[PDB]
Amino acid sequence: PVRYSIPEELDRGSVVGKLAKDLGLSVLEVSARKLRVSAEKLHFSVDSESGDLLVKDRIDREQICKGRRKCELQLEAVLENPLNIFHVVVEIEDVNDHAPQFPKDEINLEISESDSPGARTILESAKDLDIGMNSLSKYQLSPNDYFLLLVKDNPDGSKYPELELQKMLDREAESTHHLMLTAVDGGDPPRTGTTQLRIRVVDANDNRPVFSQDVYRVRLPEDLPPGTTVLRLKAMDQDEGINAEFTYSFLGVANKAQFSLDPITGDIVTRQSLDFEEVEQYTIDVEAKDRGSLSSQCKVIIEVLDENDNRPEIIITSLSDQISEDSPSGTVVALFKVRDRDSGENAEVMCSLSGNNPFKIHSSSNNYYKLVTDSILDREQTPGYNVTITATDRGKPPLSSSTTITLNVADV
Amino acid sequence: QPVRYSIPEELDRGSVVGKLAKDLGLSVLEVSARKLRVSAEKLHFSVDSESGDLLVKDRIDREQICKGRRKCELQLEAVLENPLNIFHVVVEIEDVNDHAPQFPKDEINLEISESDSPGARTILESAKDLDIGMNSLSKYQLSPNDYFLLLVKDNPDGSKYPELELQKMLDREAESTHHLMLTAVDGGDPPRTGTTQLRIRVVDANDNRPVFSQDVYRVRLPEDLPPGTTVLRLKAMDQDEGINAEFTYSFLGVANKAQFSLDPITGDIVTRQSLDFEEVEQYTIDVEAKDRGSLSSQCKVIIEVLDENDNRPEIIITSLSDQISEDSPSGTVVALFKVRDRDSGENAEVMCSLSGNNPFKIHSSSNNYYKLVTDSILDREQTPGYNVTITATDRGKPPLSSSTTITLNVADVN
Ligand SMILES: *[C@H]1O[C@H](CO)[C@@H](O)[C@H](O)[C@@H]1O
Ligand SMILES: *[C@H]1O[C@H](CO)[C@@H](O)[C@H](O)[C@@H]1O
Ligand SMILES: *[C@H]1O[C@H](CO)[C@@H](O)[C@H](O)[C@@H]1O
Ligand SMILES: *[C@H]1O[C@H](CO)[C@@H](O)[C@H](O)[C@@H]1O
Ligand SMILES: *[C@H]1O[C@H](CO)[C@@H](O)[C@H](O)[C@@H]1O
Ligand SMILES: *[C@H]1O[C@H](CO)[C@@H](O)[C@H](O)[C@@H]1O
Ligand SMILES: *[C@H]1O[C@H](CO)[C@@H](O)[C@H](O)[C@@H]1O
Ligand SMILES: *[C@H]1O[C@H](CO)[C@@H](O)[C@H](O)[C@@H]1O
Ligand SMILES: [Ca+2]
Ligand SMILES: [Ca+2]
Ligand SMILES: [Ca+2]
Ligand SMILES: [Ca+2]
Ligand SMILES: [Ca+2]
Ligand SMILES: [Ca+2]
Ligand SMILES: [Ca+2]
Ligand SMILES: [Ca+2]
Ligand SMILES: [Ca+2]
Ligand SMILES: [Ca+2]
Ligand SMILES: [Ca+2]
Ligand SMILES: [Ca+2]
Ligand SMILES: [Ca+2]
Ligand SMILES: [Ca+2]
Ligand SMILES: [Ca+2]
Ligand SMILES: [Ca+2]
Ligand SMILES: [Ca+2]
Ligand SMILES: [Ca+2]
C-alpha cells in the first residue's frame, strides 16, 4: 500500500499526495471511474480537475490517536468498471500546538511546621496532549530557600513533580509562602504552562511558653495580711490556638503550705501570715505547661522584713536574797539579762528602774545587766525592797515589759 | 577579754569543753564554795566539783540552734555567789559532716514532649544539706546518657540546683520512657551522696505523618463489574498515638472520583458507576492521608479495565453494484465491504461466512476488507436475482454474531 505523510491541523484543500498520479490514472479515467476516498469516521475528496488527494476535514492527531506512538490511517479508494479497492496509509506528523497545562492555575497547599526535613509531597502532574518530542519535557520552579523540586515518573510514562523540603518550616518567622511552578515541553518553539502554588504553614507545638523574667524577686513585711496578692506572673506562648494555651503550676512541693496560685491569672497570693523569726525567705519553683507537654520553669524568691512584733523578756539568771546590812556603795545585789526575738534595731534594748530605791543598774558586756546599790542603806528605813524594772525596745513601736522582784536584808 | 573554746557538735554527755576554772584561776575551793553556775540560753552545762571543769549536759546540734548562719558562737556565762559575779565565755561549734544531702522526694516523675527543641533547659528540685560551709553540698552528677547532659547552677540563696540540658531531641516512637539517676555529693571527709531516680515519660507529638503500606496500588478489573462494588481497601498507619494518630483518606485528584466513592473511616474505595473499556482503559488516581494536623502523605492508585466481548461486530458495505453483467468472468468483484469491532485483542478478531448457495466467494484483501467476487459463471435465464445473507461472528467468548442481507441482480446486455 502506498504511504504518504502530512502534518496535522492543515488547512482545507491541502494536498496530501498524488495517489492517482502514483497509480498512473489519467484524468479521463479518474472521471469515468467514480473515485471515492474513504476513511473511518472521516472524509476526503479528489477533484476531477487535478485528480489528487486533498483534505476535506480538519484532522486532530490528539483526538483520534491520544497516547499512541504513531498514527497511520488506512484510507481506501474505490474504482468501478473495472471495480477495485486500493489501500493507502497516511502518517500524521505531530505539531506542537497543545501547550502543557496544569489542572488548576492556583494550587493551595497546607504543610505542617513540625514536618521533618527531607519529606516528599506529590503534586498534580501537568497534561500535554502532544506526544513524543513535543510532549512535556521538564518541570522547574521558582527558586526559594525552603523548598527543592524533584520529578518522578508514574507507571504510565507521564512525569509528575513532587516537592522535597531541605529545611524545616517555621510560621513564627514566615507564615505563608507563594511560589511559581512551570512546566516546559521539548519543541520548537517551546511553550510553558505555569501554576502558582500557595503554601500556608499550620501551627505546631514547638515553642514553649516563656516567662517575662527568669528570676522573680519581691520584698514583703511579715505583718502583711493573708489573702494579699503577693505577685503576678507573666508568660507568653509564641504558638497559636490550642498549642498556645498554658497554665501555671507549683513545681515545688509543700512550698504552697500558706501560698496559693491562680493558674488562670497566674497570680500568687498568701493564705496565712508569715513570721520573720521562722523562715526569713522563701524560694519556690513555678513552671508553666501548655496543652502539650512543653513546660518552662522560673524561680521566685521572696524576702520577709522583720517587724517589731516580739516584746523583750527579762530573765533573772541569779540574785542574792540574803544581803548583808553593812553593804557598802557599789555592792552587787542582783543579776539579770534581756532577750528579744526580733533582729536589727528591733533587737536593741533600753531599760530603766523605778528610781525610788537607791539602787542603780549598770550594763556589762553582751546584754547582761548588773543591779547594784549606789549608796549605803539603813535597815530602819526599809528592811526589804521590791523593785519594778522596765525594759523597752528600740524599734517602732517600742514594746516594754516590766518585772517585779523582792529582796530582803537582815542584820545579825 | 572573754575566754573562748572550740568544740565539734554532737558530742557525748560528759565531754570536756574546756578547763574554764583553771583558765580563770578559781580552783576547786572557789568552785565548790562559791556556787558556780554555767548558763546559756536554751542549753545545759555542768561542772563537777572534783575536777572543776566545763562538761556538756545536753547533746548539742549545730544545725538546730544555728541553721544557715555563717558561724556559731554560744555565749555562755558563769555565776559565782557571795560574792556574786558574772563571767563571759564564747564557744564556737565546729561543723561535722553528719547530715547527708537528701532530695525532697525519692521518686521524680517528669512528662516531656517529644517535639521539644534540642538545647532546652529544665530546672529540677535542688537537694537540701543542713551542713554549712565545707560539709555543704558541692556538686551534682547524673548517670551518663546520650540524650541528656546535666548542668549545675546556683540560685540567689546560695544553694546549688541542677537543670537538664538536652543535646539530642527525643522520639517516643523509638523509646517511650527513660529512667535516670540523679546524685548530689557534698565536699567533706568522708563524702556523702544523696540519690534520687527520676522517671521521664515522653509524651506524643505530631511529627509523624500517616503512611500507606505501598506507594503504588495496581488492580485489574473487568468492565462488566456492577456498580457499588468495594473495589479496594486501603491500609495505612500513624506511628503517633491518640489524637495525633487519627487520620482520614482523601482524593487528592479532582474529578477522578467521578464514579468512585471513598469511605475514609474504613479506608474503602468503591465504584458507583459501571466502566467501559472503550472509554478509558486505565485510571490514575492520587490519594492522600491526612491526620488531625496538616501532615499528609500521597500514594498513587492506578487501575486497569479488562475488555469484555460486549460489542458485536458491524458489517459495513462500502460499495455495491446493482446491475451485474451476465458475461462476468470468474473472479470478477461484485461487492466490497469491511467489518468493524469496537473491542480489542482476540475479542476483536472476526470470522465471517456466507450462505454458499450462490456462486459468490469472498477472498480477503489487506485490512479487514473481504472482496466479494463470483467464482463461477451464472446465467440469468436460470435465476435472475440472488438474496445473499452474510454473517459475521466474533472470536471471543461468547461469540457475538451480526448478519446483513444484500440483494444482487443480473442484467443482460443483449
Ligand atoms: C516557559 O519557558 C520557555 C522556555 O523553555 C519560554 O519560552 C516560555 O515563555 C515560558 O517562560
Ligand atoms: C505563568 O506564566 C506563563 C508565562 O511563562 C503565562 O503564560 C501563564 O499564563 C502563567 O501566568
Ligand atoms: C513600756 O513603755 C511603752 C512605751 O515605750 C508603753 O507603751 C508600755 O505600755 C510600757 O509602759
Ligand atoms: C510594768 O508594766 C507591766 C505592764 O506593762 C506590768 O505587767 C509589770 O508588772 C510592771 O508593773
Ligand atoms: C556518692 O558519691 C560519693 C563519692 O563519689 C560516694 O562516696 C557515695 O557512696 C555515693 O556513691
Ligand atoms: C542512691 O545511690 C547512692 C549511690 O550512688 C546510694 O549511696 C544511695 O543510698 C541511693 O541508693
Ligand atoms: C450468531 O451466531 C452466534 C454463534 O456463532 C450466536 O451465538 C448468535 O446468537 C447469533 O445467532
Ligand atoms: C443473519 O444472522 C443473524 C444471526 O444468526 C440473524 O439474527 C439475522 O436475522 C440474519 O438471519
Ligand atoms: Ca491538534
Ligand atoms: Ca499536536
Ligand atoms: Ca506540547
Ligand atoms: Ca516556630
Ligand atoms: Ca509553632
Ligand atoms: Ca506551645
Ligand atoms: Ca514575729
Ligand atoms: Ca518580728
Ligand atoms: Ca522586739
Ligand atoms: Ca548535726
Ligand atoms: Ca553537721
Ligand atoms: Ca553534708
Ligand atoms: Ca518521631
Ligand atoms: Ca511522635
Ligand atoms: Ca500524625
Ligand atoms: Ca463496554
Ligand atoms: Ca468492551
Ligand atoms: Ca467484539
Numbering used by the authors:
A (entry chain A): 2 to 413
B (entry chain B): 1 to 414
From the reporting publication:
By contrast, in vertebrates the clustered protocadherins (Pcdhs) provide analogous cell-surface diversity, but in this case generated through stochastic alternative promoter choice. Biophysical measurements with domain-deleted proteins showed that Pcdhs also interact in cis, through a membrane-proximal dimer interface involving extracellular cadherin domain 6 (EC6) and potentially EC5. The specificity-determining cell-cell recognition interface of Pcdhs involves domains EC1–4, as shown experimentally through mutagenesis analysis and suggested by mutation correlation analysis.
